[PDB]
Design a protein around this ligand. Sequence first.
Ligand code: K
Ligand code: K
Ligand code: K
Ligand code: K
Ligand code: K
Ligand code: K
Ligand code: K
Ligand code: K
Ligand code: K
Ligand code: K
Ligand code: K
Ligand code: K
Ligand code: K
Ligand code: K
Ligand code: K
Ligand code: MG
Ligand code: MG
Ligand code: MG
Ligand code: MG
Ligand code: MG
Ligand code: MG
Ligand code: MG
Ligand code: MG
Ligand code: MG
Ligand code: MG
Ligand code: MG
Ligand code: MG
Ligand code: MG
Ligand code: MG
Ligand code: MG
Ligand code: MG
Ligand code: MG
Ligand code: MG
Ligand code: MG
Ligand code: MG
Ligand code: MG
Ligand code: MG
Ligand code: MG
Ligand code: MG
Ligand code: MG
Ligand code: MG
Ligand code: MG
Ligand code: MG
Ligand code: MG
Ligand code: MG
Ligand code: MG
Ligand code: MG
Ligand code: MG
Ligand code: MG
Ligand code: MG
Ligand code: MG
Ligand code: MG
Ligand code: MG
Ligand code: MG
Ligand code: MG
Ligand code: MG
Ligand code: MG
Ligand code: MG
Ligand code: MG
Ligand code: MG
Ligand code: MG
Ligand code: MG
Ligand code: MG
Ligand code: MG
Ligand code: MG
Ligand code: MG
Ligand code: MG
Ligand code: MG
Ligand code: MG
Ligand code: MG
Ligand code: MG
Ligand code: MG
Ligand code: MG
Ligand code: MG
Ligand code: MG
Ligand code: MG
Ligand code: MG
Ligand code: MG
Ligand code: MG
Ligand code: MG
Ligand code: MG
Ligand code: MG
Ligand code: MG
Ligand code: MG
Ligand code: MG
Ligand code: MG
Ligand code: MG
Ligand code: MG
Ligand code: MG
Ligand code: MG
Ligand code: MG
Ligand code: MG
Ligand code: MG
Ligand code: MG
Ligand code: MG
Ligand code: MG
Ligand code: MG
Ligand code: MG
Ligand code: MG
Ligand code: MG
Ligand code: MG
Ligand code: MG
Ligand code: MG
Ligand code: MG
Ligand code: MG
Ligand code: MG
Ligand code: MG
Ligand code: MG
Ligand code: MG
Ligand code: MG
Lengths: 124, 138
Amino acid sequence: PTINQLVRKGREKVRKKSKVPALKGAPFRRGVCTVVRTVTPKKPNSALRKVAKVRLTSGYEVTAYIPGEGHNLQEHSVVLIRGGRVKDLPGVRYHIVRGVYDAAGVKDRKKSRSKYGTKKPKEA
Amino acid sequence: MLTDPIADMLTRIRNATRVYKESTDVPASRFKEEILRILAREGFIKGYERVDVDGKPYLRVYLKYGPRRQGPDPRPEQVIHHIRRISKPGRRVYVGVKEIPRVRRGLGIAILSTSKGVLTDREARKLGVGGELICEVW
RNA sequence: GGCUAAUCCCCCAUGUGGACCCGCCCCUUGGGGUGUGUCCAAAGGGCUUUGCCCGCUUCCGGAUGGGCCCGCGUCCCAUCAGCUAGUUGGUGGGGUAAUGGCCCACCAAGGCGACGACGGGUAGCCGGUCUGAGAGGAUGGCCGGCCACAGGGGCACUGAGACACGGGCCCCACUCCUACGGGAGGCAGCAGUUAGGAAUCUUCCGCAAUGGGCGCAAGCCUGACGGAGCGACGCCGCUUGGAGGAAGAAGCCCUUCGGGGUGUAAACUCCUGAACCCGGGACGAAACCCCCGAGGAGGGGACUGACGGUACCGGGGUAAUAGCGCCGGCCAACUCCGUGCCAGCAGCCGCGGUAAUACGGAGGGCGCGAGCGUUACCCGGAUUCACUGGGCGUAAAGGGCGUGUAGGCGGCCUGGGGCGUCCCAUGUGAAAGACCACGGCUCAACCGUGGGGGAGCGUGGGAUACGCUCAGGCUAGACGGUGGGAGAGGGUGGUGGAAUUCCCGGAGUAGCGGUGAAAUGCGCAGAUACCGGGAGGAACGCCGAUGGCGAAGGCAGCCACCUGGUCCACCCGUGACGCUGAGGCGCGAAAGCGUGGGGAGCAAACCGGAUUAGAUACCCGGGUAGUCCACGCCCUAAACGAUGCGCGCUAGGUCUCUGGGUCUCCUGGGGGCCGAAGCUAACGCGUUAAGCGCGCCGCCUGGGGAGUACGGCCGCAAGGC
RNA sequence: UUCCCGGGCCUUGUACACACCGCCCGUCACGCCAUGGGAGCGGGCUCUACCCGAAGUCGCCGGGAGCCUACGGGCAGGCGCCGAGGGUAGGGCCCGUGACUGGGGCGAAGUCGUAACAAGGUAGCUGUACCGGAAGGUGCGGCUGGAUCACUUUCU
Ligand SMILES: [K+]
Ligand SMILES: [K+]
Ligand SMILES: [K+]
Ligand SMILES: [K+]
Ligand SMILES: [K+]
Ligand SMILES: [K+]
Ligand SMILES: [K+]
Ligand SMILES: [K+]
Ligand SMILES: [K+]
Ligand SMILES: [K+]
Ligand SMILES: [K+]
Ligand SMILES: [K+]
Ligand SMILES: [K+]
Ligand SMILES: [K+]
Ligand SMILES: [K+]
Ligand SMILES: [Mg+2]
Ligand SMILES: [Mg+2]
Ligand SMILES: [Mg+2]
Ligand SMILES: [Mg+2]
Ligand SMILES: [Mg+2]
Ligand SMILES: [Mg+2]
Ligand SMILES: [Mg+2]
Ligand SMILES: [Mg+2]
Ligand SMILES: [Mg+2]
Ligand SMILES: [Mg+2]
Ligand SMILES: [Mg+2]
Ligand SMILES: [Mg+2]
Ligand SMILES: [Mg+2]
Ligand SMILES: [Mg+2]
Ligand SMILES: [Mg+2]
Ligand SMILES: [Mg+2]
Ligand SMILES: [Mg+2]
Ligand SMILES: [Mg+2]
Ligand SMILES: [Mg+2]
Ligand SMILES: [Mg+2]
Ligand SMILES: [Mg+2]
Ligand SMILES: [Mg+2]
Ligand SMILES: [Mg+2]
Ligand SMILES: [Mg+2]
Ligand SMILES: [Mg+2]
Ligand SMILES: [Mg+2]
Ligand SMILES: [Mg+2]
Ligand SMILES: [Mg+2]
Ligand SMILES: [Mg+2]
Ligand SMILES: [Mg+2]
Ligand SMILES: [Mg+2]
Ligand SMILES: [Mg+2]
Ligand SMILES: [Mg+2]
Ligand SMILES: [Mg+2]
Ligand SMILES: [Mg+2]
Ligand SMILES: [Mg+2]
Ligand SMILES: [Mg+2]
Ligand SMILES: [Mg+2]
Ligand SMILES: [Mg+2]
Ligand SMILES: [Mg+2]
Ligand SMILES: [Mg+2]
Ligand SMILES: [Mg+2]
Ligand SMILES: [Mg+2]
Ligand SMILES: [Mg+2]
Ligand SMILES: [Mg+2]
Ligand SMILES: [Mg+2]
Ligand SMILES: [Mg+2]
Ligand SMILES: [Mg+2]
Ligand SMILES: [Mg+2]
Ligand SMILES: [Mg+2]
Ligand SMILES: [Mg+2]
Ligand SMILES: [Mg+2]
Ligand SMILES: [Mg+2]
Ligand SMILES: [Mg+2]
Ligand SMILES: [Mg+2]
Ligand SMILES: [Mg+2]
Ligand SMILES: [Mg+2]
Ligand SMILES: [Mg+2]
Ligand SMILES: [Mg+2]
Ligand SMILES: [Mg+2]
Ligand SMILES: [Mg+2]
Ligand SMILES: [Mg+2]
Ligand SMILES: [Mg+2]
Ligand SMILES: [Mg+2]
Ligand SMILES: [Mg+2]
Ligand SMILES: [Mg+2]
Ligand SMILES: [Mg+2]
Ligand SMILES: [Mg+2]
Ligand SMILES: [Mg+2]
Ligand SMILES: [Mg+2]
Ligand SMILES: [Mg+2]
Ligand SMILES: [Mg+2]
Ligand SMILES: [Mg+2]
Ligand SMILES: [Mg+2]
Ligand SMILES: [Mg+2]
Ligand SMILES: [Mg+2]
Ligand SMILES: [Mg+2]
Ligand SMILES: [Mg+2]
Ligand SMILES: [Mg+2]
Ligand SMILES: [Mg+2]
Ligand SMILES: [Mg+2]
Ligand SMILES: [Mg+2]
Ligand SMILES: [Mg+2]
Ligand SMILES: [Mg+2]
Ligand SMILES: [Mg+2]
Ligand SMILES: [Mg+2]
Ligand SMILES: [Mg+2]
Ligand SMILES: [Mg+2]
Ligand SMILES: [Mg+2]
Ligand SMILES: [Mg+2]
Ligand SMILES: [Mg+2]
Ligand SMILES: [Mg+2]
Ligand SMILES: [Mg+2]
Ligand SMILES: [Mg+2]
Ligand SMILES: [Mg+2]
């Protein structure tokens, strides 16, 4: 474009939309579960994966994945959630942190405990 | 009409150099003549002269080239590789003494215009004067 | 209701002076000087008391701090376009330290606005911080500067100073007391509590230091501050040992069963000695004060330490926390077993359905370390909003075309000015921070000192090449004169031939029509075919094309009239009068709409016949709107050369339209083709550029959703932007 | 050597590359989300007109209805302008809910068909008009992004 055009209209600054509506620049969000379900994946894969309907203190209600080999989640269970999405499972914009509140960490995982929220096992 | 007589000249030079022409004709002016004086002093051209075509004044600029080369495409290396106008109509480029650029690590020159007249980059640097930056040539 | 003191209030005098009206002088907005008239001062107290100290009154000036005015800069939405009513300005008043429409009367109708007003959304701004090569982008916590607020709203007093966080008044909500009439309360001060929340501290020590208020002083107050505590929240510093140690213990893991791996790693040997135990114990602290001197200068003496028995010094002195992510590719580090599209991993490409280096475990390995990953957010890579630093022939993107307002841009020469631009000097650019050098805590972090800088603007001076402006001039751009030329350029009116269809007439017979093949249909009221005559509409065969005209749409028999655009020649005239062009305006194929007319052929819909599994279609027979004309609307498109306009430069060859010429050929303009250089991702473009450059307009930033939803504008409607 | 099957060479078109037993369109039906219109009913803001209007400055009265007085006046008190706020009516905007209802996306793949890519079987695209279970069909006109020298006939 001509210089004068840039003098008049000028360049446009691109915006960015949040993929995590926990609002408040939220690192995490606390919420109470609604249901506990099993969702069928899209075309690329086949499996039974554990998700949950969660109402949030922010006022939002969204689905959240449940990592780990096994878990315990009831209807009214209290759960802290974090950002990040799940690609093979459309509609899930959030992850559930384990080891927090009513969500217990996975049992007997000795490789990576940190992300799955397990304490260091007893010594030899 | 001609929007930028300077740019017209320089572009004609670029063209003529691309086709390895002998000389080229440019409309006569004091500015242009001075710029060509700077061009001749640093040896980017064989030289110039005042000529008359039809009933109108012109300037014959004799180009400059290198020796014949080897392999395919016998065309000799351009003495002037790249030349481009900087200041333009609608955007004027003005630089102070400390704003004066340095072309190709000194391997090339910059043509400016000050109140002391048309100068090179090193000339304007030594005289310590800023002005309009007309174009870059290397 | 009553007594009473004073630096409380008042009255009179004193007029160094100042204040006000009027006059004069100078200066120039209300600055200063001066004259008469008028008006104005006041506080005492303590002494080491008859001399000093503190304080008071008036005026001038300085210093400090601040008010008001102005130039410039200051986010997002144009689906917010008109906004303003004391609003804009003036006269006269009120108010204030002072201008102001701050406030009030009267008069006028002005003021703001695509250079983004008003409206909506959002946000304390800055010194700086983070990132980045740079430009820039984002951010405004801590420290510092300014602003605003003090439960929500509003108002004044006091006073130098407030529209006043721990002052006052009222209204509103809430809490508390109430004898129910009424009052009390305002932690966005320190700490602490509650609630919210992913989440942020001790209801601590101290007036020693610094600073602040009062006081002659002693001194008092000070959650300002100086300190400590809690929190790996961040940065920095340090320890968990150092050395000697077998081809190499065990255990474990691979294994070609030979061996290899963990690995000098450990045991062990020796040495050092974080932690802890004692001893000594700091800088920060010398002033205010007292003495001499003079209550000055100078000299001398004395008191005072929250941190804190802490920093540190000296002596003794134990081998004494390691964890976390990852190991398919990006990306550095591999094997065994388990699992079998299950369980699950994931940032992207993806892994897993029997032997997975991707899941789970194990061995081993890599990265980092008192930390390591995850999520969220910012810059980056990203030249992906491109000033540096991009694009629009086919990937996203040329506006349908023209006219032309604002705006942007400016041919050659001479001169003035010196707004832009450039230079010197000066003022500002606070401190901290950032950069450099030295130094203080054993170093670093941190701190100190000093040095170095800096864009931007103000002021004074200087330069005049370019830009600008004024003065004058030139003629290559452009316009015009004269003389020629072509063309389906456009409007009005008239007119001609061929053919289709219908009517009339003659002649004439058994079918014509139509398909892949048939049938519907027409025909004994006599068709098809032939001839003659008439009617009427619509389109113009050969010429005619690879052609021409127009700005685009588009334009085709011929005559006349009205009229636009354009090419060439003669160098004749004017003298830069130019290019572009947001908005506006006009034009704008076909379809469609309104009114009226006209209607041969054609033909959506539709009435039918075939074909087919079905045929709401392709084939066939009919047939309305429409097609046409008049006027008024509708603004769309593959409105395409998928290439905005104007100018300059850059090999040619070939075909053609048209104009001129010394007419084999040269030249000017237009339309095609092959192609130098060059450009292009390729195809391809290539003097008709998409090449080399310039000026200006429009437009693009992944696909789908969707040219949809909603809003606004235009239209009768359909719809369009 | 026209046609049926297999095959070869050259060329042309392609939206095919597990390669025409290919790809691919849409109505309807099933699964899952978000969204528009929207009567009606709540809530909020703003604007105009009228009306009520506390505190407080300012303004007037301040008198044989009050108090102090050096008689000059002052205070109290009263009235009034403005005014926070409140009410009425009207207008507009935002926000919540909302019966009914429009279309959309993704997915699991069912249904009627063959639309589009080879002349995709009537070349396609297109703006517009009308009609049709649907893709679509046809009329007017336009474009080359159209092949080629000149009955019909689905799907995987
Ligand atoms: K006097
Ligand atoms: K004092
Ligand atoms: K002294
Ligand atoms: K040890
Ligand atoms: K496998
Ligand atoms: K593995
Ligand atoms: K693994
Ligand atoms: K990013
Ligand atoms: K277009
Ligand atoms: K033509
Ligand atoms: K090439
Ligand atoms: K329309
Ligand atoms: K052969
Ligand atoms: K193609
Ligand atoms: K009285
Ligand atoms: Mg799978
Ligand atoms: Mg993420
Ligand atoms: Mg009394
Ligand atoms: Mg006197
Ligand atoms: Mg006097
Ligand atoms: Mg007196
Ligand atoms: Mg006002
Ligand atoms: Mg006045
Ligand atoms: Mg005044
Ligand atoms: Mg805010
Ligand atoms: Mg703020
Ligand atoms: Mg960058
Ligand atoms: Mg940097
Ligand atoms: Mg804070
Ligand atoms: Mg509060
Ligand atoms: Mg005071
Ligand atoms: Mg204040
Ligand atoms: Mg106060
Ligand atoms: Mg308080
Ligand atoms: Mg909580
Ligand atoms: Mg103190
Ligand atoms: Mg002090
Ligand atoms: Mg071993
Ligand atoms: Mg060792
Ligand atoms: Mg020792
Ligand atoms: Mg020892
Ligand atoms: Mg003495
Ligand atoms: Mg002394
Ligand atoms: Mg590797
Ligand atoms: Mg399993
Ligand atoms: Mg993992
Ligand atoms: Mg396996
Ligand atoms: Mg991985
Ligand atoms: Mg960038
Ligand atoms: Mg650019
Ligand atoms: Mg690009
Ligand atoms: Mg395109
Ligand atoms: Mg165009
Ligand atoms: Mg124009
Ligand atoms: Mg103009
Ligand atoms: Mg010029
Ligand atoms: Mg100009
Ligand atoms: Mg100047
Ligand atoms: Mg300076
Ligand atoms: Mg500084
Ligand atoms: Mg040092
Ligand atoms: Mg410094
Ligand atoms: Mg100056
Ligand atoms: Mg001069
Ligand atoms: Mg002139
Ligand atoms: Mg003529
Ligand atoms: Mg004509
Ligand atoms: Mg008829
Ligand atoms: Mg007869
Ligand atoms: Mg019959
Ligand atoms: Mg008969
Ligand atoms: Mg007949
Ligand atoms: Mg033309
Ligand atoms: Mg055309
Ligand atoms: Mg002449
Ligand atoms: Mg003349
Ligand atoms: Mg039209
Ligand atoms: Mg029409
Ligand atoms: Mg009509
Ligand atoms: Mg009609
Ligand atoms: Mg039938
Ligand atoms: Mg038909
Ligand atoms: Mg017919
Ligand atoms: Mg020619
Ligand atoms: Mg030509
Ligand atoms: Mg040619
Ligand atoms: Mg070519
Ligand atoms: Mg080439
Ligand atoms: Mg190629
Ligand atoms: Mg667009
Ligand atoms: Mg998108
Ligand atoms: Mg999008
Ligand atoms: Mg539309
Ligand atoms: Mg064959
Ligand atoms: Mg052969
Ligand atoms: Mg081939
Ligand atoms: Mg087939
Ligand atoms: Mg009233
Ligand atoms: Mg009142
Ligand atoms: Mg009163
Ligand atoms: Mg709703
Ligand atoms: Mg079709
Ligand atoms: Mg079709
Ligand atoms: Mg087909
Ligand atoms: Mg057909
Ligand atoms: Mg077809
Ligand atoms: Mg087609
Ligand atoms: Mg159509
Ligand atoms: Mg039909
Ligand atoms: Mg057609």
